[PDB]
Ligand binder design. Structure first.
Ligand code: PC1
Ligand code: PC1
Ligand code: 3PE
Ligand code: PGT
Ligand code: EHZ
Lengths: 606, 86, 63, 57, 64, 172, 99, 459, 173
């Protein structure tokens, strides 16, 4: 019973205070953003103490606080599980969002609803460390939609932008398709393993979780924006820059991957399931990167570069490498979060322009932003001894050094080469060139808020993996005897990809006209997915709803079979009964029939 | 962004027409109608407004682009589109 | 909207804070009952089978 | 203080409150007819205390 | 208001039962309902079959 | 109304160059290719056969519709651009400000006084500006959506309120 | 003129007669008093104490009494070594199954 | 028992004999007071229901609905004193008389100990609602609407009358306890199905299931605000209460005959929610959403599983509170625009910022966003249904996926987007509408802390 | 301790003695130290103040006990007077058995974090105990229906040795 368990939980109760203070409305209506930024800072500072306690000892907590309600044999209770996967994530996650908050005030220095904006970010935050810290599947399901709905409002921050609502509607849709798999896993675990706490599921050793794991995989694909369920994340750049910098870069989009890491022990028992985990990661890596190197918006480039990373993360969890995938969460949190407000720096400074074809020569104009981007891009490519090397170079070596699908392994190499490819495209068009923006120049980065925020992660990204790899206990099996030819592949492919991408990029400088290649017509159009899947299925289901369904059944048939038919029959036989002549000759004739038939025909007398 | 005011617009405006070698600097007037006196062909008029478009960073609709016809009128349509009154 | 929001923070807190101290006050005055065994020759009261004082008082006065 | 009129316009406010205290009366009257098995079920039947004569009212 | 009327009320008065309307109503009506009935029936006709002869596992399934 | 041929060619010239800019990207290429693109335009300027000019613009945009950049360059403020009605959610109609509580109205006395002048002006101007409308309306309803100015002195041009009092494009 | 009717009345704005109008009724003094009733007899006496009443309601469904019995019962059962909860409920020794 | 009934009926002389303008005040006072007394009834014992006399008793299922109905009673008075201000005092008094007379019947039926006694006021609720829909309804097709609503329920209720009296002549009394203790296995004889059909169809009709649901869109839209809430928040739920009570003597016949309704309900919810995706009328869209949620309960009750009953009672209440709120949202918007088309008044958030919030948790609650009581309902039902069959999750989850699209569809079309230029009568929201809206949402989240209160006797 | 160790068997904790060799100071010792005289002691000071106040005016409460009552297998046919006692007794035992499964479930879940990476084999005893409980619980109350009653529980049970004795007859051959 050390302070570890006590103060790992208060960190959560630290950063919920700004939410309560805002509802008072006595809260400072001017310096509110500073209030939350400092609050997250203290939440970060508190968060190290559980961390520092960890690598020394190695104790991970499960605290079962107030018992919500008990269901016969089920005891659904608010319980927080401070695993290594958790006790590490809160320190990095707040560290990133604290820097994002510092960048946020500078970037969004004119938005009149800025107090609302910072409130939303915190509300998103709370939904996050209750997702990662979730001892039971139910409160894990709490975050899985708490973050999703929070994204919808944040994405549609500019409510009037009709496309932003469409993107916001798009995000919740693709998430809910994944959410379908989530409840399927919840239903199976409760029906078979009779619980939702992760402890009972592991102990009940459901070593044949065919349907559960498929449900978990489907849940991850929607949240982590995989093939079939990716395009919401690239389309989610319509929100403001810090919004994409925090949620859809390295904090919320990675949650889907984090789900498998939580349920890794059950996944490794199965063999079939991890196939399409690395299969889906393989296709996601290539396709997102393939569309990445042809886009013309920095937000589009970076976001696709993310989805390629989450394609890469699931490749490792494919072949029994959960913690290395979690290791990749750590590094991706640093440098990927960087590239956004680094890009956001150029966007705001160069009059909110996001078309990569308008910069050039920014190397000398914004030396710090240019310096920040080159370190970030090199980290993403996986330059040795800095951030990405400690994870990606290990991962590429890891999946290569295993019994995997041959086709799956090949795409990871192509993706890594393509990973460097769009990195050159950004550095080439944006920085290495000549000015192309409007004549009046307003380039500026001297604001301390932008400088401090970027520098704060810079020192983080420079060392990064060195500290984490050296600190965490040695808890994955390290392969040792690589035939040098494939151990260099982690560096050969990116260096190779660096070469031609540079050659292809400065071929634009060559005076020769660029004829439109059909592959370019394919890659540049988001890989043709949004044009079809966002127009054909939506039209059919919508046309079914109105033409058929409502009009055909609800307003035509269902109102005619039971109600109108009886109403018609009653009216059709109300008129002929009431349509009498008034002449007794016919009435008395009817009586004579009645007397005649009743007396004899129906045997009433006998 | 400092308030872009109509005096700055015309300064930037006539900066570009004077830049246009087809309109040498000497006879630029604020209301110098292009083909009436400068002889600038209307086919190049649909070309000087994209120069304006990048100059101030926004799109000029075609409905009025063909109507954007004089440097003063160039400035006039610029001001209201960005509520420039000072 | 501002006046309306102020009305909750007035009217909800009008009974909220006196209840807030009252719940704590009974927790700093008489505390919580302990699971004592059934004494011999004395059947307990109907409301006695509860540990929290407010629950006992509610049982005493209402049910 | 105007009581000849505050009574006329606010005598309605006492109707429901007496209705509730009335409602308890039939509630605490109807149960008497339902005595029947008073301290008779072997689950709850027990030795009758020295002074009180009725276990549950 | 014309659009709302044409899409809310002015359907049945302008509706006429024809083979196109009739078949589409039947196809989108009883069709899916009976289809799901067969799917659920055979699934339940396999489930109780397994447990009846003890060919299914619910060792830890209690909260049904 | 009549989308006569010359405007269509200007439509072709303006939009194609923008697409061409999205292709060349580099300024020297854009400048170089624009001139040759310009050069191949004005060279065929002598056609008494307007039908032939139309035939020359059959394959014209078809090549463009092939040659169109799948992601053309748009300034963000324009339709399709990133900053399209981004600041719309902030702009609020002026008439809603009449609802303001008197204490709120008291917070801005002179500006509200200026509103009264605008409210006063639009009142009598409406009858004057509407009166100008019927007395000069073309027969058989309006033939063109263009609105005639204030012919006489003093009166404001008809239907001026919403255009003049339109919320500014950068409201905050 | 079809029928001698009246034109559709225009929706009056309660605010322009009295800016502090609360939308409960036209007359200001009762409108202010309706505020007091809807809040005092709304949020105040129902939501606050009602929540505390239901929250501090005595043992409902015997959720804790069964626990204490189970702890004692389970403590009895494994002490003797017999299975901690029998597969049968109504003792078959008495049961007089037909044939 | 009595401590709720006489206060409710003695409230009627108060409204009739109150001052000319104080009617809304004193009625609201004691309606909330009655709610407080009803909350005192919310307590329940372990297994034996809270029994009061031969005439009245309450269980862990009746009590949550009882406090809901009494809780509702102030809300119609709050929601109605805007479109009835310009009415003669007698008609206002008559309108209030209808509501509390309606509400009085609801306490009676939920606490009824005998099925026939449950039956007599089961249709007696129709008479006050028929008056409310017809007289004070603000539309033209309300006349045909009232006829559709009235005849549908009677067409289903009368077979129950013949069925119920048949039980009396065959199995003695129809006291709910005596039925439960003396339950016998219903045979498969071909008469017992018509026995089964009659005992079920009555609750089917006023719990709109696909096919027998066309009255609801006509019931809700043309009904006035107070009529819409009471009809959607309690009236669709007498059918629910009946099934949990009457399915005691329908087993094992329920096991085999459940199939046509289960397929009709499970497929119907996908169809009905699809209608929501393309509804032109805001009130109709909310009405059709009630069908989808209610059809989910049909599967819940008719599976006959401990978990299924529990999630039913969770959705039993949560949907009612939510649907009443959404109808308040539509009503609070309607008179300002004097139209029901959704696209008439877009971009309302920029004009009314607080209503943007109130619409927002309202949409989220209908989304079954955890931990709202709606999620506890749907999620519990899915697990019970999934245990019954593995396939149903394909239908089950698809509903949630459709439920997401149409729920935020009203949010984007109305709240977000560009404000409509032409309209200029949108005034700042009266704090009555604001207060009422919190009167709905606040207990919902307050209920999240204690699901056990509304889980039901199966809990 | 408030609860019972027999109900909740807690294996003794193996806490290694701290024997570091690196000269640079171990920080986590210091953060625990400052926490001790900044949070723990003030909390304890308030706690000892509240606990002594609680003991100043101590009020007691006991645990209700229901004596055994004839159940449904000896209750006469119909005769709802005896059925009432029978049904209530059975439902009370249903509550106890539900809590019995709950107690076992917590013990099984307690092993998981307690045994860490040794969970798979260390508490196989906990696994079989839950397996024995859950299987036996299934034979008792499972598939009784949402309208479960002691009559149905007897009915479902009466099928069990009906099949079992039929199997025993077949087994004897
Ligand atoms: C020790 C005590 C500490 C203070 C506790 C204060 C209360 C609290 O937070 O309790 C937490 C407890 C937590 O239980 P616990 O098991 O953690 O134990 C409590 C003691 N501690 C925290 C120290 C362990 O939960 C509850 O009390 C439940 C509160 C539910 C509130 C429900 C309100 C409903 C209002 C309805 C209004 C509308 C009615 C009409 C409509 C109805 C619906 C249709
Ligand atoms: C310091 C803070 C403490 C907070 C404590 C927790 C919150 C307390 C909130 C109190 C108000 C909410 C509960 C209302 C209960 C209504 C009465 C009830 O349940 O039944 C009628 C009850 C019970 O009906 P009865 O009187 O027929 O019951 C017979 C049995 N005895 C006599 C033992 C109760 O009525 C009475 O007890 C009569 C006395 C007046 C009761 C007035 C109640 C309303 C005002 C309070
Ligand atoms: C084994 C190891 C293999 C390593 C391979 C490394 C390849 C690296 C990528 C090279 C090709 C892509 C490239 O160079 O992209 C940059 C560039 C962008 O050109 P563009 O988008 O047209 O913009 C022109 C603006 N004036 O120039 C371009 O030409 C873009 C071309 C777009 C289409 C590229 C398709 C690549 C397919 C790769 C294989 C995919 C799986 C089969
Ligand atoms: C709009 C149409 C109705 C809507 C749908 C309602 C539900 C559909 C079925 C309606 C059934 C109504 C009659 C049921 C009354 C109670 C039934 C009952 O208790 O079960 C009896 C079932 O017995 C019946 O015959 C009941 C009626 C069967 C259905 C035939 C009549 C009802 C249908 C036609 C009239 C209603 C339809 C509308 C007509 C305009 C048991 O008696 P038994 O036959 O077993 O008696 C012992 C022995 O065998 C001889 O009696
Ligand atoms: C990258 C390239 C992609 C591919 C890009 C497109 C390249 C291929 C198409 C090039 C144009 C095509 O050959 C012929 C044609 O459409 S039109 C010829 C000129 N004749 C006229 O249009 C009618 C008479 N003339 C006028 O109307 C005015 O002279 C004019 C408005 C033209 C100039 O302005 P002023 O003078 O009014």
């Amino acid at each position: 019973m050390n302070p570890f368990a006590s103060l790992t939980l208060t960190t959560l109760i630290i950063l919920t205070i700004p939410i309560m203070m805002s509802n008072s409305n006595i809260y400072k209506t001017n310096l509110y953003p500073n209030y939350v930024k400092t609050t997250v800072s203290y939440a970060f500072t508190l968060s190290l103490v559980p961390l520092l306690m960890f690598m020394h000892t190695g104790q991970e907590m499960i605290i079962s606080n107030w018992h919500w309600m008990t269901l016969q044999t089920v005891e659904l209770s608010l319980s927080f599980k401070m695993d290594y996967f958790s006790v590490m994530f809160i320190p990095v996650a707040l560290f990133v969002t604290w820097s994002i908050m510092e960048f946020s005030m500078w970037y969004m220095h004119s938005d009149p609803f800025i107090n609302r904006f910072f409130k939303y970010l915190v509300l998103f935050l709370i939904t996050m460390m209750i997702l990662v810290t979730a001892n039971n599947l139910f409160q894990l399901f709490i975050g899985w939609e708490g973050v999703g709905i929070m994204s919808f409002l944040l994405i549609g921050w500019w409510h009037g932008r009709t496309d932003a609502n469409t993107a916001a509607l798009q995000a919740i849709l693709y998430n809910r398709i994944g959410d379908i798999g989530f409840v399927l896993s919840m239903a199976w675990f409760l029906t078979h393993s009779n619980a939702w706490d992760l402890q009972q599921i592991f102990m009940l050793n459901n070593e044949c979780p065919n349907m559960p794991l498929i449900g978990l995989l489907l849940a991850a694909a929607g949240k982590s924006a995989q093939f079939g369920l990716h395009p919401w994340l690239p389309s989610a750049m319509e929100g403001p820059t810090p919004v994409s910098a925090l949620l859809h870069s390295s904090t919320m989009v990675v949650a889907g991957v984090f789900l498998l890491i939580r349920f890794y022990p059950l996944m490794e028992t199965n063999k079939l399931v991890q196939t399409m985990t690395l299969c889906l990661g393989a296709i996601t890596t290539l396709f997102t990167a393939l569309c990445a190197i042809t886009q013309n918006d920095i937000k589009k480039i970076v976001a696709f570069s993310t989805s390629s990373q989450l394609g890469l993360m699931m490749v490792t969890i494919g072949i029994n490498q959960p913690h290395l995938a979690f290791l990749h969460i750590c590094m991706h949190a640093f440098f990927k979060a960087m590239l956004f407000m680094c890009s956001g720096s150029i966007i705001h400074s160069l009059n909110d322009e996001q078309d990569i074809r308008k910069m050039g020569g920014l190397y000398k104009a914004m030396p710090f932003t240019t310096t920040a981007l080159i370190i970030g891009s090199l980290a993403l490519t996986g330059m040795p001894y800095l951030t990405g090397f400690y994870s990606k170079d290990l991962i590429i070596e890891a999946v290569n050094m295993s019994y995997t699908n041959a086709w799956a392994l090949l795409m990871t190499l192509i993706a890594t080469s393509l990973t460097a490819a769009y990195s050159t495209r950004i550095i080439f068009f944006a920085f290495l060139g000549k000015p192309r923006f409007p004549p009046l120049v307003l380039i500026n980065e001297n604001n301390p808020l932008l400088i401090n925020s970027i520098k704060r992660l810079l020192i983080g990204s420079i060392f990064a993996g060195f500290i984490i790899s050296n600190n965490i206990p040695p808890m994955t099996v390290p392969n040792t005897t690589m035939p040098l030819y494939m151990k260099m592949t982690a560096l050969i492919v990116t260096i190779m990809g660096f070469m031609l991408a540079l050659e292809l990029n400065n071929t634009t400088y060559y005076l020769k006209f660029k004829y439109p290649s059909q592959t370019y017509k394919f890659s540049n159009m988001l890989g043709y997915y949004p044009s079809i899947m966002h127009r054909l299925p939506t039209y059919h289901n919508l046309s079914m709803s109105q033409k058929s369904a409502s009009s055909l059944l609800d307003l035509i048939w269902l109102e005619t079979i039971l109600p109108k038919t009886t109403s018609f029959i009653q009216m059709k036989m109300s008129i002929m009964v009431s349509n009498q002549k008034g002449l007794i000759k016919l009435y008395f004739l009817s009586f004579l029939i009645t007397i005649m038939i009743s007396m004899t025909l129906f045997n009433y007398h006998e | 962004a400092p308030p872009l005011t109509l005096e700055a617009i015309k300064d930037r405006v006539l900066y570009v027409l004077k830049l246009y070698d087809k309109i040498d600097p000497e006879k630029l007037s604020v209301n110098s109608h292009f083909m009436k006196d400068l002889g600038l062909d209307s086919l190049d008029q649909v070309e000087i407004i994209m120069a304006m478009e990048d100059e101030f960073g926004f799109e000029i609709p075609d409905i009025d682009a063909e109507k954007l016809m004089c440097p003063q009128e160039i400035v006039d349509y610029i001001a209201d589109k960005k509520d420039v009154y000072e | 909207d501002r006046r309306f929001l102020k009305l909750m923070r007035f009217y909800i807190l009008l009974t909220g804070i006196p209840v807030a101290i009252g719940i704590t006050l009974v927790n700093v005055f008489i505390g919580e009952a302990e699971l004592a065994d059934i004494p011999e020759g004395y059947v307990p009261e109907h409301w006695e089978y509860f540990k929290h004082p407010i629950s006992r008082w509610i049982a005493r006065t209402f049910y | 203080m105007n009581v000849l009129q505050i009574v006329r316009d606010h005598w309605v406010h006492i109707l429901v409150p007496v209705g509730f205290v009335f409602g308890c009366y039939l509630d605490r009257r109807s149960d008497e007819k339902l005595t029947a098995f008073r301290n008779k079920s072997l689950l709850f039947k027990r030795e009758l205390r020295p002074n009180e004569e009725v276990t549950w009212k | 208001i014309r659009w709302t009327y044409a899409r809310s009320a002015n359907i049945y008065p302008n509706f006429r039962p024809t083979p196109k309307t009739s078949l589409l109503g039947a196809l989108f009506g009883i069709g899916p309902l009976f289809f799901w009935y067969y799917v659920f029936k055979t699934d339940r006709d396999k489930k109780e079959k397994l447990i009846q002869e003890g060919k299914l596992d619910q060792t830890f399934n209690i909260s049904y | 109304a009549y989308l006569t041929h010359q405007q269509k060619v200007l439509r072709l010239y303006k939009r194609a160059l923008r697409h061409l800019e999205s292709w060349c990207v580099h300024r020297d290429k854009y400048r170089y290719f624009a001139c040759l693109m310009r050069a191949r335009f004005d060279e065929h300027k002598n056609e008494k056969d307007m039908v032939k000019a139309t035939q020359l613009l059959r394959q014209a945009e078809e090549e463009f519709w092939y040659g169109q950049h799948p992601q053309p360059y748009i300034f963000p403020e324009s339709p399709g651009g990133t900053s399209y009605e981004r600041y719309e959610c902030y702009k609020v109609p002026e008439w809603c400000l009449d609802d303001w509580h008197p204490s709120e109205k008291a917070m801005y006395p002179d500006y509200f006084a200026k509103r009264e002048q605008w409210k006063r002006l639009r009142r009598e101007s409406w009858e004057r500006e509407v009166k100008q409308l019927q007395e000069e309306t073309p027969p058989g309803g309006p033939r063109t959506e263009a609105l005639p100015p204030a012919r006489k002195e003093g009166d404001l041009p008809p239907l001026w309120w919403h255009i003049v009092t339109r919320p500014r494009e950068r409201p905050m | 003129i079809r029928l001698q009717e009246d034109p559709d009345p225009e929706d009056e704005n309660l605010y322009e007669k009295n800016p502090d109008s609360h939308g409960y009724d036209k007359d200001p003094i009762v409108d202010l008093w309706n505020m007091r009733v809807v809040f005092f007899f709304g949020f105040s006496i129902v939501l606050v104490l009602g929540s505390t009443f239901v929250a501090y309601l005595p043992d409902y469904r015997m959720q804790e009494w069964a626990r204490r019995e189970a702890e004692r019962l389970v403590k009895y059962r494994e002490a003797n070594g017999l299975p901690l909860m029998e597969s049968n409920c109504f003792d078959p020794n008495k049961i007089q199954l037909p044939e | 028992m009595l401590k709720i009934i006489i206060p409710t009926t003695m409230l009627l002389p108060m409204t009739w004999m109150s001052k000319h303008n104080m009617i809304w005040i004193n009625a609201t006072v004691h309606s909330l007071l009655i709610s407080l007394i009803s909350l005192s009834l919310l307590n329940q014992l372990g297994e034996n229901s809270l029994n009061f006399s031969l005439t009245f008793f309450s269980d862990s299922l009746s009590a949550p609905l009882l406090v809901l109905t009494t809780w509702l009673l102030p809300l119609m008075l709050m929601a109605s004193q805007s479109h009835l201000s310009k009415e003669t005092t007698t008609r206002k008094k008559l309108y209030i008389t209808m509501l509390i007379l309606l509400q009085l019947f609801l306490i009676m039926t939920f606490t009824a100990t005998e099925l026939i006694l449950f039956y007599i006021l089961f249709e007696a609720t129709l008479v006050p609602t028929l008056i409310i829909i017809t007289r004070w309804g603000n539309q033209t097709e309300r006349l045909n609407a009232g006829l559709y609503f009235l005849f549908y329920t009677l067409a289903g209720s009368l077979p129950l009358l013949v069925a119920l009296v048949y039980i009396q002549n065959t199995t003695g009394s129809l006291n709910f306890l005596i039925i439960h203790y003396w339950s016998h296995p219903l045979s498969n004889s071909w008469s017992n199905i018509f026995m089964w059909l009659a005992c079920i169809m009555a609750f089917m009709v006023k719990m709109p299931l696909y096919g027998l649901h066309l009255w609801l869109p006509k019931a809700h839209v043309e009904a006035p605000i107070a009529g819409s809430m009471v009809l959607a928040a309690v009236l669709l739920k007498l059918g629910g209460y009946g099934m949990m009570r009457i399915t005691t003597i329908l087993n094992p016949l329920t096991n085999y005959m459940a199939y046509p309704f289960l397929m009709l309900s499970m497929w119907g919810m996908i169809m009905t929610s699809s209608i929501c995706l393309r509804q032109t009328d805001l009130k109709s869209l909310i009405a059709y959403s009630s069908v989808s949620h209610m059809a989910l309960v049909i599967v819940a009750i008719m599976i006959q599983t401990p978990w299924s009953f529990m999630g039913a009672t969770a959705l039993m209440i949560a949907h009612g509170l939510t649907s009443s709120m959404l109808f308040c949202l539509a009503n609070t918007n309607y008179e300002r625009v004097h139209s029901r088309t959704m696209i008439l008044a877009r971009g309302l958030q920029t004009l009314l910022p607080l209503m943007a919030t109130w619409w927002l948790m309202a949409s989220l609650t209908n989304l079954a966003l955890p931990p709202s009581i709606n999620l506890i309902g749907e999620l519990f039902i899915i697990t019970a249904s999934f245990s019954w069959s593995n396939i149903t999750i394909i239908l089950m989850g698809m509903n949630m996926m459709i439920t997401a699209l149409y729920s935020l569809y009203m949010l984007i079309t109305t709240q977000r987007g560009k404000y409509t230029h032409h309209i200029n009568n949108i005034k700042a929201s009266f704090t009555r509408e604001n207060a009422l809206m919190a009167l709905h949402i606040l207990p919902l989240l307050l209920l999240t802390l204690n699901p056990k209160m509304i889980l039901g006797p199966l809990y | 301790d408030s609860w019972d160790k027999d109900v909740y068997p807690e294996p003794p904790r193996r806490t290694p003695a701290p024997a570091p060799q690196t000269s640079l100071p171990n920080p986590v010792t210091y953060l625990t130290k400052i926490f001790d005289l900044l949070v723990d002691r003030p909390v304890t000071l308030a706690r000892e103040f509240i606990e002594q106040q609680h003991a100043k005016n101590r009020y007691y409460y006991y645990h209700r006990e229901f004596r055994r009552v004839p159940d449904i297998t000896e209750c006469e046919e119909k005769d709802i007077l005896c059925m009432f006692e029978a049904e209530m007794q059975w439902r009370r035992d249903y509550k106890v058995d539900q809590e019995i499964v709950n107690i076992i479930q917590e013990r099984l879940k307690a092993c998981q974090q307690r045994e860490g990476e040794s969970y798979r084999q260390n508490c196989a005893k906990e696994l079989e105990q839950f397996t024995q409980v859950s299987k036996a619980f299934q034979d008792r109350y499972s598939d009784l229906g949402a309208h479960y009653s002691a009559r149905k529980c007897l009915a479902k049970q009466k099928q069990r040795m009906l099949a079992e004795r039929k199997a025993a007859k077949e087994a004897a051959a």
